[PDB]
Design a protein around this nucleic acid. Sequence first.
DNA 1: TCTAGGGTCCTAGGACCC
DNA 2: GGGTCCTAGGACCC
Length: 342
Amino acid sequence: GSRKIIHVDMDCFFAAVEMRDNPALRDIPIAIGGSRERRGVISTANYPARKFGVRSAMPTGMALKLCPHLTLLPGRFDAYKEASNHIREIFSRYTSRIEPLSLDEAYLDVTDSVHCHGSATLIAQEIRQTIFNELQLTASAGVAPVKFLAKIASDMNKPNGQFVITPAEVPAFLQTLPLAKIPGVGKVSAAKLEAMGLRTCGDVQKCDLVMLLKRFGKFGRILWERSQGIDERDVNSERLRKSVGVERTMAEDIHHWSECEAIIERLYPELERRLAKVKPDLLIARQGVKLKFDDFQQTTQEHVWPRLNKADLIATARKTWDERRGGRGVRLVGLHVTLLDP
DNA sequence: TCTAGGGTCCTAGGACCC
DNA sequence: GGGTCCTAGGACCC
Ligand SMILES: Cc1cn([C@H]2C[C@H](O)[C@@H](COP(=O)(O)OP(=O)(O)OP(=O)(O)O)O2)c(=O)[nH]c1=O
Ligand SMILES: [Mg+2]
Ligand SMILES: [Mg+2]
């Protein structure tokens, strides 16, 4: 009863799009990210920049210290959305069982597909070739019987390559697979697991489920499952967005309420425009604000509210400012909405 | 080096309901 | 006491 799941993942997505649209960037180190003066981080980097150690989520000041000639780009999100829509239309040529996880990646369930003699290996190759033929961008892919193995597999032969895990190969693959490779196991969880002597799925296989359930809750069940190749999550295709948020980090911290309110005045019409694209009457379930301080602690306060309203967001930010700020600088202000449950 | 902005999901205490 | 909604925080992902 094995499913065939493909995970398709665009190579250096934002940067690949910028290089196609400006071939002068093809061989120099480039990254999409905010300037050091805007206190930015790297969204992504091309392979010439990665060679220096430049990575996603790296602070831009660190990226430039590693790669002084890094060319920093602002990002063209409509260009990326356009490429995303196109590759999702290419996925639809092969199956309707498509769960996009972000602009540049998706799960495909091709169990019931009849496109390349039921070969998921060849469907993945054909999708990657079509994407290259029609978008001049490359993609990598992973093929496995379950979601998480497919997603791990798509990383192992990038860029512009794929990797297939058959059911026969799953036990040997798992034995030495680091836990940190499992989606959902991040730095904090991996360090906790490491401090129990648990580094790989093989380690977790020698663990008692009751033990993991005590020390991790529902996460310990997931750890126990994945360590055996168990991942029953179905490819959905029905997921909908639940929130809309708009936030900005200032180049310098602000110390005065007048400055905070001015920022909100600039953020609010952007939040309204994005909400209106999906709910034109602006009806919502909750709205709220976010402050982040110069020491990097952050607070959110949100509440039931029927319709996007600027003055209530200002009032709420003023309460949060007055109450939970303690003379610190503020580096970030954000606005937030929770969408109604349709 | 000095730490984004777009999000999802889980936890957990108290309110509230029965 | 058992279920369920509000809310803040935080790990995590892209
Ligand atoms: C991981 C990450 C990605 N992104 C954006 C930029 C990425 O190009 C896009 C998709 O992310 P990824 O697929 O994680 O990264 P990538 O495509 O650039 O690199 P890879 O070739 O390894 O797949 O999302 C961020 O803005 N911040 C992040 O921390
Ligand atoms: Mg990618
Ligand atoms: Mg991706």
